[PDB]
Amino acid sequence: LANLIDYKLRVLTQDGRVYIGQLMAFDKHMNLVLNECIEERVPKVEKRVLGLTILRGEQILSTVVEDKPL
Amino acid sequence: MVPPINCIFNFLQQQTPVTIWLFEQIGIRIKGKIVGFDEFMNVVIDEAVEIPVNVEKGTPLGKILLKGDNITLITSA
Amino acid sequence: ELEELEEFEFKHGPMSLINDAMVTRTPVIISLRNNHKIIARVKAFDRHCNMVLENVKELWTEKKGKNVINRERFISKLFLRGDSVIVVLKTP
Amino acid sequence: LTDGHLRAPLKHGVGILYKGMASNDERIVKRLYEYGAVSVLLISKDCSAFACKTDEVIILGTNLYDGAEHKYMPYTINELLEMVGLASGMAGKVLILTSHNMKAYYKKFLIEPLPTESYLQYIIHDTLNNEIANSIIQSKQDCVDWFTYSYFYRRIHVNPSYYGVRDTSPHGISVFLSNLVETCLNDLVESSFIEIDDTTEIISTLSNGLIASHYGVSFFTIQSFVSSLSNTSTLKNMLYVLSTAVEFESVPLRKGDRALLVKLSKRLPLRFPEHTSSGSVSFKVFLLLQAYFSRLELPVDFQNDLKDILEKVVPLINVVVDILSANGYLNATTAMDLAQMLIQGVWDVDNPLRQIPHFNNKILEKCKEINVETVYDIMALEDEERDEILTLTDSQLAQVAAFVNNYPNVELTYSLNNSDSLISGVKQKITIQLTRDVEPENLQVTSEKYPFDKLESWWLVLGEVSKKELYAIKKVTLNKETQQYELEFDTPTSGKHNLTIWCVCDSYLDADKELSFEINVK
Amino acid sequence: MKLVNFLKKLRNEQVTIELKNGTTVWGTLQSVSPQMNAILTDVKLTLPNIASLQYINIRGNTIRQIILPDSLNLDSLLVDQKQLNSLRRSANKRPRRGL
Amino acid sequence: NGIPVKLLNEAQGHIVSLELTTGATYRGKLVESEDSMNVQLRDVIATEPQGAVTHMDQIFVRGSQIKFIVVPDLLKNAPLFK
Amino acid sequence: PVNPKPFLKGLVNHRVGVKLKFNSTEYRGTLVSTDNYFNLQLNEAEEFVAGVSHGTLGEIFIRCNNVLYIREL
């Protein structure tokens, strides 16, 4: 997970919503902080710019490498 | 302004009939007297009854050990 | 000493069903939370009921535009999480 | 088709031979060899005692593995000799497949004679203990004069460099020898086998050295028993203590026995103490005793090791129960139960019914059908019911009958000298009358899972349950039908004292006959 | 003992993980964390129409089950931790043997 | 403790937005954040999944019930880059 | 105090039935044993779904987490 640091990552939430953001840090619970994170729902449609977000590790399903770091 | 475990203990001593709201289930709630409990809030409940709200009917269950995880809201009736 | 007590409690507790399954190499059927069932032999187990199962036959129920039909498949080497277990039944 | 794989190899003209086999099957193999049906026979090392005369012999590998050593070790030149005696011609042919390091060793000591040496220097502690117990050696002078008879003595003179005695001379020998025996004596007095006091010099024997020397158990094993065994010890601990001994050095392991021990440990009643080593032969002894108590289907490899263990254990378990008696702990009861379990092969709580020879689950159920609990109810049974219960072969039925007959229903009675006059700290003699159902023709003990023969014996026990103190014990061989035995035992302190007497057989389980009585001591 | 260690053994293995949400995963395990968090590479993933992904990290609690290859040696992989525990746990008369 | 817990403690005194497991969104000034993610919030504007919006003075929600937070961009500078 | 653990210990070796949170399944059988985390083992078990007998399962293990309550029958 440390290799994934600073990367743009796609996290899939428990509810099925898709969040995309830079992975700045994690912890034991897999609580993630995501910089410049935006949300996509259906697939672009229903995309929103959230900004800096924490996500809970209990809600996270999976993460994938989206793009390279800024 | 009393801890909840002490509240449950006064239910224990008073032997008042107790109504428990379960978790994520509005349809049914369980009722009966608290004869004892543990640290996990598992409760031995005597003359317990299932109370479907959906006039209310119910099923007499006799003695029961109810697990504390179901517990949403403990009350007196 | 503590280790001994844990193994013993495991032996005489409800866990005895999955212990007996591993030692006798007997098939057991597991009702899971996905509404799927796994009849198989227990290769390994865990306190969480994590399991290594061999000769897995999983049975499920599917609904279509007519009568409900049962479906089943064979998975020879299956490893299972411990929380999906609703029930582990041991039978003849 | 016994020896489950002996079929397919032997079918193509190569036979299999190893210890532990079905004997019939082995004999068939041998007959094929003699008649020429099998031209080739593969014999395991331990079967060198079975001498099958050959025209030629091949020896494949000089290295055998033992776990205890934790590496392969080459064969004894003795084994190789017993391995070359089999072959004779038209010309005697012996192929020996060896390493380069072992070539010079075998190529010399097989063709040229074996130089003989003496290993006494290792066992001197036990040997000298034995001499002191027999009280032939009254003093240290006496022991040196006793060491004059040793093949060791002659040897240390002709080749002193082998034994580490640097000085070669009459005085040098004397000094070195006296050094050795002095070290021995310090170990014995420290371990409480003996005691030494100045007035030439006087040496006396204690309760530990008595039993150790009598049963012949080695010094080190006894010292280990002493260190581990205390009061309030459990049956598991006693069994561990039994497993840790030097007598089990002769039980072989190659890598499979140990891995299989791990796999077997799921199925066993007990669990080895965490602070000792698994690879050590002690753990294996432990699990094979477990497999003796629970009758598992053992590999034929492990059957032999079980047999070896059983050949050792009876003296050892006797020492275990007696050493606890010497330390005056009432828990010797559990040691007695364990000894019974070793003679028979069943647990105390699991079932008394399984004790009777050749019982299995189904047959036991019929006993529950007739609602029998103890074995004594089988003695009152008559022939028609027995026929209904056991449908089996005639030899097995006969052994069961012999079991029933020689297993006595014996009654425990006591007669005390004076119940009114009871003084504290005095040697109080009791006369216990014991009486037997049938007078024995011979004392043979009958058990299937314990192949070796045993004579029956008994232990008379007096102690108080709450304090966990055993006041008195004695061993008896009851040949007659009715006898009397006098326990000379010191009385406890003043006041009311519960005294419970057991009559516990060394062999047969569920023979425990008890009578409880209490006396007020002044 | 701990089956998670058995999963730790499974690096470079091609597996199909069914998940509690019903998702099917197919890929080569690069590692599994003790949390049973599984990082995989060359993964085709089917949500309940397959998406091809270079790397996928899955949180352990979401894993329903993992289907292993039939070629795997379970006898060998299952017995480790006991041997490790034994390793962590670990006089004249020495030579029963002679000359 | 968690590094994101440390950031979230830095977020105290700022205006944050919170989405709970139910889906309701609470925007307001974060008074207090415990280690367990329990948060005390002020002058909250709340948007329900149905779209209705309400105003409340003081709200405190359990950690376990929070889906996620959005915190101001000021904190992104440091010191979590290390 | 009479705790759930002693009541359950006294309930061992008796015919019981257990209603799971789903209520989709109830199990009536002899209570063989229960562990410290409160998993359940029953013998001769019978399954009652929707209050009707589904079938006779036999020796059965119930994950603790699914148990809503246990009652003596």
Added chain:
Amino acid sequence: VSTPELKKYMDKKILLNINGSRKVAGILRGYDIFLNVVLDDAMEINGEDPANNHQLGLQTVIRGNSIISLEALDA
């Protein structure tokens, strides 16, 4: 185990929203490390119109694990 700092909410009337879209109003009385709460003058607000006074002086206990959120009615 950490204790929630609820002391500021003590003896204040609060509206708890709880799992299953349930809502109750009552004065905060006790709490513990577990976030389990004792409420006095508890009033259930049912989905329809009405509200029932469940515990006027007899109070009640709510499992902290079931507590979704808590609103302070007072300041």
Added chain:
RNA sequence: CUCCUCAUGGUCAGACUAUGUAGGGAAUUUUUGGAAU
């Protein structure tokens, strides 16, 4: 691989960091599911 605990060696006035034959990561706020339909 990660977090905690513990131990530890160091540094600062309990905290931080390297290492560990260590313990651990199923009973309310996260990883042994209230989900299923």
